[PDB]
Design a protein around this nucleic acid. Structure first.
Lengths: 52, 109, 340
RNA sequence: GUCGAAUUUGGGUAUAGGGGCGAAAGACUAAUCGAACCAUCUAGUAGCUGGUUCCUGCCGAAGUUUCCCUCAGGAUAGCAG
RNA sequence: AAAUAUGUAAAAUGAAGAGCUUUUAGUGGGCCAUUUUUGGUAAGCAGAACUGGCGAUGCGGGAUGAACCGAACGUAGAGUUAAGGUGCCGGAAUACACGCUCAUCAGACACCACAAAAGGUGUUAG
RNA sequence: GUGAACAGCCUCUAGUUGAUAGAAUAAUGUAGAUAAGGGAAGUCGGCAAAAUAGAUCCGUAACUUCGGGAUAAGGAUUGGC
RNA sequence: GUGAUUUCGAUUAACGAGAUUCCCACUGUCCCUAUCUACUAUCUAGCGAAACCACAGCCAAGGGAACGGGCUUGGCAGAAUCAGCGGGGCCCUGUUGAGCUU
RNA sequence: GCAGUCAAGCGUUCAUAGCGACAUUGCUUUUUGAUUGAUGUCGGCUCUUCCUAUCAUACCGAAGCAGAAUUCGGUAAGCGUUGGAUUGUUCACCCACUAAUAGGGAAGCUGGACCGUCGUGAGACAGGUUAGUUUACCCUACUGAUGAAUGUUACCGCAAUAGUAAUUGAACUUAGUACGAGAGGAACAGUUCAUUCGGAUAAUUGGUUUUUGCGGCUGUCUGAUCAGGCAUUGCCGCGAAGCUACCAUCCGCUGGAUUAUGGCUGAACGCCUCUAAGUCAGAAUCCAUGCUAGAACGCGGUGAUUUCUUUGCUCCACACAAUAUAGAUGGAUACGAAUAAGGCGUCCUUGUGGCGUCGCUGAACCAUAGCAGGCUAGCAACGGUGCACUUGGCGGAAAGGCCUUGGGUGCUUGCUGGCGAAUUGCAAUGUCAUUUUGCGUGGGGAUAAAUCAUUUGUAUACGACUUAGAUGUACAACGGGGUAUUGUAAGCAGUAGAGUAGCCUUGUUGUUACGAUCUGCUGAGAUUAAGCCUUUGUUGUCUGAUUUGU
């Protein structure tokens, strides 16, 4: 059987990873960043409520 | 005399890991301390300045029983408590050394 | 016998297991935390409606064990810069937030109740007139640091734990330039970061924790209480604390939270955000656990498939629990003697 | 295993070492019975094991011919005085 | 007919102790090597005779050591050397000179020994 | 008292409460137990454990020196009122 | 001297802390372990031995002759300790017969 | 192997004085493809490590290798390499199972000899002597656990080094395709499972019960009921929590450099050549990534650092002591790269440029005169240099140093003068450096912790670990509510109950006493953290001891 370190299956994994998997990763990270910005804005709005 | 005895957190005070609580030894030593304090009182020493200046334990003649040797290890103990109390060297210079000292003195004030 | 890579079988130096590798950074991406802190709060069972082409269980429903990790948002209280040297990474500067809660100030004491609680009182004096010293240290980090990590602490007072001392850790910041990382940290000083701004559902994460201790076992020696890093645990649900119907799915309309009847055993109810992770993770209930992002871009269809949960088991774990809610229990039993 | 006897058991009595006793086992005969224990002759017999007590100076080997039919053992030559 | 290799009898070199007669002690195994010789094995080798080494013997050297190379020993000082060495360990030339070699585990030795009969489009000189 | 019973178990009269103590409860050890599915696949070797077990009624083979084998084997039953 | 008895040297019921091969039943013997109880194991107070003991006590290679803990060359090497465990400590000589010959 | 056959060559040169590499009759032997296992003192299991002379898995080379399957070979030890029978334990061998069931090195229980006798074409004696010494509480190895010292104490880190892990089979699709008269029949890319091994885990299922939690049973005892004691866990059913199981569940990766081999360019050698210089790919290999430990004499970042313990602690200055120095005695004086090449200067049409010049040693360069360096008078120049300050930058690899601004203050040997030195007696280091630790002065600064003891159980043999505790959304003990376990409490009542007896208003629900059991009150009652959850209640507590300083 092909090993975990098998070069052919490693090349196949690399070419697969370069595509749809990485696209999913990038979209996920963008959404996570957007909701992190939303979280910061929410806390800053609570601080603004305190000031007001 | 601490081979294969237990470890205890109460050793940390003295930096050791092996300490015990020998009751019989403590009782004898504190009887001797009480006797020495009474002796100091009779001598008229100031009990607040007293510290244990000497203490010494050595081995007494062994006493046997049988039930193989089966002996005890008796002790002689002595101790002394003492009051704390607050608190020409000629030089042989050579002639050259004396001359150098004199030259220094003349060069200075 | 045994895997020789897990030698020596000695106790972990700390109860909080160390993260020894963060994901490789990509500067073009936005600033994100690589890791999060939580407390293990028991396990339960779910029914998943599986969509996995090729499998014999495609379009069929399976029952899975899951772990629930109680994750109230972490508080950002500091930043540390690292410079690379011919001898490795070296920390150059630590900058702290102006105010720190007693929750984190307890971490710096062995005997809190007896102390004058002077920790960071002289540090707070640096935020006095201009913040010039704080700004100089942040400028030093921006100029020389090649790696930036944020100091965060857990809000352990939000948990059911008897411990009042919060856990403090470094979390690597990935994405953005060094200056953008430092700006993000400075903006988030004394602010909370929520678990859903770090992770999201269907994502594969890694669990780092110290395992269950077993004392001396028969060569003989210490068994358990080792640091372990288990990888590829799928997130089945990122729940919200302020959300009723935490345990309700689209298929199960019963309005109920994630907490089982009678509470988790040896751990209270879940009143915060939580992570439901497929399978088991190292550690036992109440242990502090570190959740890390995947180190590599996973090439599995398992990392891609969406999770559709049908049902979450909220029966009592304190016996052979038969009822999901006390209302159901009452509706089954009927009217008891003390009801009249 | 045997458990009413070819049984178990107390006390008294008999049998003593070139022996006794023994449904006979070189079994047992007062903590080694191919033959008890105690004292004496007896400090019994040496092939042999182990040990063998101060200093310095000077001289200094052999580790082998021969005959006793040969092997132990002995004698004479050789070396050192 | 120069003599490898022993005897007899008479010039060289050396020698202060020699001969005889009485006496006294310890000793009574061998191992290793050279040389010659006779008989042998696939190969080792075996039987003799001689002469050395060791035994009773320290010291320098061969990193180390029963049989290898130097040299035998009162206590010291100075000088010079043996065998062996002189990048560093480590005292002493990373001296001088002419050549050869590049090894995908060179070589720095027992060798006028065994693998050794050869194979090579490595290199040098004939 | 139970019970066939000087068994085992509990009690009355009488006697004793002696054995160095205290604190913890990891592995191991010793003693005593339980266990899904399988059922000797274990081992030189079913070693050890397990299973059986009292009493009443029925029923009982080969072989036999006619006395036995025999509680052969194999079934049913057992409380309280 | 043989050892019941009978029958035809064989055979024999009953019995055996005697020997051997299987069967049912049974099972932690095992697949394959897991758990519970008690005393220990552990620490403390008191009491308190012994075996053994040239000195010591980390490894690798070398040190011709059972051979290395000590020598040579390297690896190394950091107070003081607790526990588990056991890896080490054919020809020659006589007699006698038996073949050949003047 | 025997005899040969000639000889490639050799033999003191010598062909059959003599040798002799490499190559060629006959063998168990008869032809047409008939019938023709050893091992007894070794062997089992477990289990570690190593070799490669590789059985399988990976990658290649060749072969009528069409495809499929196979054969032979090359690199390769990363990873594995069965369950049972067998007419003596064993291996041969059989049944099967598997990808395969390779061969070896190192390597704790266990299933004798001699002496002596009558005799000898010839047996016996059972006479006599002699030996059978390796079956943990110490040292050390290994595996875990503490720990003094580096001012104290606390938190967050780095990473030298050491170890290292994954494995094999199948299925879908590619496909009934390529290939083939047919019979048959692949693979890459894309998917999905399982095997062996490893690390965890306890939601669920199963096992386990001193939870003696609930219930039941026997015998005895407490007068009976109630409630209990004893039977060495009395026995039985269920049983949470905990522990735990291939008897349960989850997880176990990706980059460089290479081997064999296939090549590119290309000499040697005017052809040619994958090799010589150079260079492209390529194995389960190597090193990394990742994972575990973290040097207790490796390192970093950060927090707080004691008030009278009779001014304790700390940073500056002078003022004296003590300390001990792997070894001051003018200066560690900064490009980078190449070496079949460079440095410096200059110029242009600005570069792989033109011209000039340098090396051939640091033998240099800078410093360098003065009581171990005194006190004074001028000249020339406005330079050189030190000290205490100040301006503006720069340096994070271990920056801790480099450069610059301004004023003040000294010196100046760039030049000319004037005084002093003696006596250390003809040499004696003849004392001039810098580490640390104390004591005294005057100049400032800051006002903590840790440990024991108590407490928790995410920990635990002991240590160690982890929580909590001076007035609070504090902690504790009770109580309350949930959540679970068991299985319907005690008491009372009934016209339910095989019947038996007593009465008499001899029945067609006449009557009374006893009566195992049944029914209702009653999913009741009991237990429920000891390592379950929660709490507007009640009551209480909030403290002793020790030590640590640059």
């Amino acid at each position: 059987a092909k090993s975990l370190r098998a070069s052919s299956h490693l090349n196949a994994k690399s070419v697969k990873r370069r595509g749809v998997f990485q696209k999913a990763v990038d979209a996920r990270e963008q959404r996570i960043s957007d909701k992190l910005k939303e979280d910061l804005l929410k806390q800053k709005l609570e601080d603004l409520k305190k000031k007001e | 005399f601490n081979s294969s005895i237990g470890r205890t957190a109460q050793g940390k005070e003295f930096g050791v890991t092996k300490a015990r609580w020998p009751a019989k030894s403590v009782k004898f030593v504190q009887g001797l301390l009480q006797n020495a304090a009474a002796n100091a009182e009779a001598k008229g020493l100031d009990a607040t300045k007293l510290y244990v200046s000497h203490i010494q334990v050595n081995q007494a003649p062994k006493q046997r029983r049988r039930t193989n040797k089966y002996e005890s290890s008796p002790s002689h103990i002595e101790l002394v408590v003492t009051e704390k109390e607050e608190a020409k060297k000629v030089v042989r210079l050579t002639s050259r050394q004396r001359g150098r000292i004199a030259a220094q003195k003349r060069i200075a004030a | 016998h045994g895997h020789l890579g897990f030698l020596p079988r000695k106790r972990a130096a700390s109860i909080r297991a160390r993260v020894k590798a963060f994901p490789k950074d990509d500067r073009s991406k936005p600033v994100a935390l690589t890791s999060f802190l939580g407390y293990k709060a028991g396990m339960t069972t779910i029914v998943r409606d599986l969509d996995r082409p090729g499998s014999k269980f495609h379009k069929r429903e399976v029952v899975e064990a899951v772990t629930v990790v109680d994750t109230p948002p972490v508080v950002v209280v500091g930043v540390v810069g690292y410079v690379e040297t011919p001898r490795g990474l070296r920390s150059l500067t630590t900058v702290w937030a102006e105010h720190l809660s007693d929750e984190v100030k307890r971490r710096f004491y062995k005997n809190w109740y007896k102390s004058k609680k002077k920790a960071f009182t002289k540090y707070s004096a640096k935020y006095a007139q201009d913040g010039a010293g704080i700004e100089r240290e942040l400028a030093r980090i921006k100029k020389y640091a090649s790696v930036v990590r944020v100091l965060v602490h857990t809000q352990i007072r939000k948990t059911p734990l008897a411990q009042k001392k919060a856990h403090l850790a470094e979390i690597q910041l990935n994405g953005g330039s060094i200056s953008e990382k430092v700006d993000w940290a400075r903006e988030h000083f004394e602010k909370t970061v929520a678990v859903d701004s770090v992770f999201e559902q269907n994502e594969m994460i890694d669990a780092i924790a110290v395992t269950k201790g077993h004392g001396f076992e028969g060569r003989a020696g210490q068994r358990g209480y080792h640091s372990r890093t288990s990888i590829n645990h799928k997130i089945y649900r990122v729940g919200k604390g302020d959300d009723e119907a935490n345990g309700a799915t689209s298929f199960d309309r019963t309005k109920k939270t994630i907490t089982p009847m009678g509470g988790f055993v040896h751990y209270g109810e879940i009143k915060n955000d939580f992570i439901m992770v497929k399978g088991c993770i190292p550690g036992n209930r109440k242990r502090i656990v570190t959740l890390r992002k995947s180190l590599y871009t996973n090439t599995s269809r398992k990392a891609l498939e969406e999770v559709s949960l049908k049902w979450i088991d909220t029966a009592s774990k304190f016996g052979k629990g038969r009822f999901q809610t006390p209302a159901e229990k009452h509706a089954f039993m009927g009217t008891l003697k003390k009801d009249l």
